[PDB]
Amino acid sequence: FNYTVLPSTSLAVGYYYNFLREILEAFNNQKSIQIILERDRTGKPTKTIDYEIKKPYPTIEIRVPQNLASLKKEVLTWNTSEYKQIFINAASRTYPFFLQGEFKEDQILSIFDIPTTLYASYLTIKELFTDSFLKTQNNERKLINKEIRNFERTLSKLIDDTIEEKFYKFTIY
Amino acid sequence: GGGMFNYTVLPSTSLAVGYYYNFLREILEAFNNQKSIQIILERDRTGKPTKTIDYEIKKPYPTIEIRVPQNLASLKKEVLTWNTSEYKQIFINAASRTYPFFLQGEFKEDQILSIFDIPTTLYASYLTIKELFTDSFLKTQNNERKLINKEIRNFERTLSKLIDDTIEEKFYKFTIY
Numbered sequence A: 001f002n003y004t005v006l007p008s009t010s011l012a013v014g015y016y017y018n019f020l021r022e023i024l025e026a027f028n029n030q031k032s033i034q035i036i037l038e039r040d041r042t043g044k045p046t047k048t049i050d051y052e053i054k055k056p057y058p059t060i061e062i063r064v065p066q067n068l069a070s071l072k073k074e075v076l077t078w079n080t081s082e083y084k085q086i087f088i089n090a091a092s093r094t095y096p097f098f099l100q101g102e103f104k105e106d107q108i109l110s111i112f113d114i115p116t117t118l119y120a121s122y123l124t125i126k127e128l129f130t131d132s133f134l135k136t137q138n139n140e141r142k143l144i145n146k147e148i149r150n151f152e153r154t155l156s157k158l159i160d161d162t163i164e165e166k167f168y169k170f171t172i173y
Numbered sequence B: 001g002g003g004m005f006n007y008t009v010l011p012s013t014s015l016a017v018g019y020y021y022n023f024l025r026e027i028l029e030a031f032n033n034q035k036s037i038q039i040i041l042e043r044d045r046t047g048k049p050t051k052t053i054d055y056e057i058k059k060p061y062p063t064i065e066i067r068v069p070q071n072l073a074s075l076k077k078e079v080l081t082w083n084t085s086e087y088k089q090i091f092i093n094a095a096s097r098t099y100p101f102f103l104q105g106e107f108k109e110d111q112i113l114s115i116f117d118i119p120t121t122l123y124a125s126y127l128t129i130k131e132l133f134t135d136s137f138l139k140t141q142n143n144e145r146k147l148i149n150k151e152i153r154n155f156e157r158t159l160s161k162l163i164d165d166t167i168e169e170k171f172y173k174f175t176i177y
Ligand SMILES: Nc1nc2c(ncn2[C@@H]2O[C@@H]3COP(=O)(O)O[C@H]4[C@@H](O)[C@H](n5cnc6c(=O)[nH]c(N)nc65)O[C@@H]4COP(=O)(O)O[C@H]3[C@H]2O)c(=O)[nH]1
Pocket: A014, A015, A018, A019, A096, A097, A098, A099, A113, A115, A116, A117, A118, B018, B019, B022, B023, B100, B101, B102, B103, B117, B118, B119, B120, B121, B122, B124
């Protein structure tokens, strides 16, 4: 190339165009989402509610742990009775988009996701730098945060360029 | 790009890392952890699987065939064209992820010949190029195609390097069409 690219840049492009925008456009068309309540052993939906989405669209909360090395664990630990798995059958893809939602009684409070793609940032660092370098002067932590903040910044830049009103919140925990 | 924080990667490098560790390797570990595949036969008007067959995965595992169109700009359209009757949608409920992994299968009667995917993540490569470079540059000396070809070859090369640093199952073949 001519241009410097950080690893999380292309990950952010993909996350926006192959996930977030697909969910937004599925909202603006179908105005509805599928909530999974009961699932058989093969992890197959059996009891599924239709839930009509509204112009006051629920905010898509992207949550990323600073401990990016723990992300693949944090995606099985936030799976709790308080949350419910939802999915959206968009025309963009041959399989639906799966998300997590917070439900108070009959009301979707929020839709959250932990971006599994951002793990590839951590792995790409672990494979470009020597372990010696990473374990020196807290270098690994500085690289992980640069990659997270680059990810968030690229999403911001992508929403401005597409003249899209924000539809997401980005929180690091 | 070392001994300092001025490190560049090609866009397709981190995409390939994600595609391998967050998709290919997860399928392999579902196979190795004796998780069977679900074949979708019947679907409702919504598109919800009505009939599923369980299918047993045996240690001569089926080869994961990654197919990439040279016309990367059409990839999001190709992922809707190769959803035909001659191929069946399958899925694998792996313990790695809270939603299953969805693939396309080739079946001779009941035998699984091969599992194939078109890597949607590689579309991000094309979009990164369309965003970094001026329209003037991309149309000048066939620059757009040169960059896309380099991105596709880098993607396959990165996959090859990642299996080598781990275990050479060679569970995948990579063909450009
Ligand atoms: N919660 C949620 N997040 C979603 C969903 N679809 C996409 N994402 C997010 O968006 C990233 C980009 O997905 P992609 O561009 O299709 O690029 C994907 C795609 O090419 C492939 N892939 C991953 N899972 C599947 C799958 O179940 N089936 C197929 N056919 N390909 C998959 O691997 C790439 C990387 O996957 P990830 O590292 O997980 O990174 C994914 C993930 O972080 C979804 O339905 N739910």
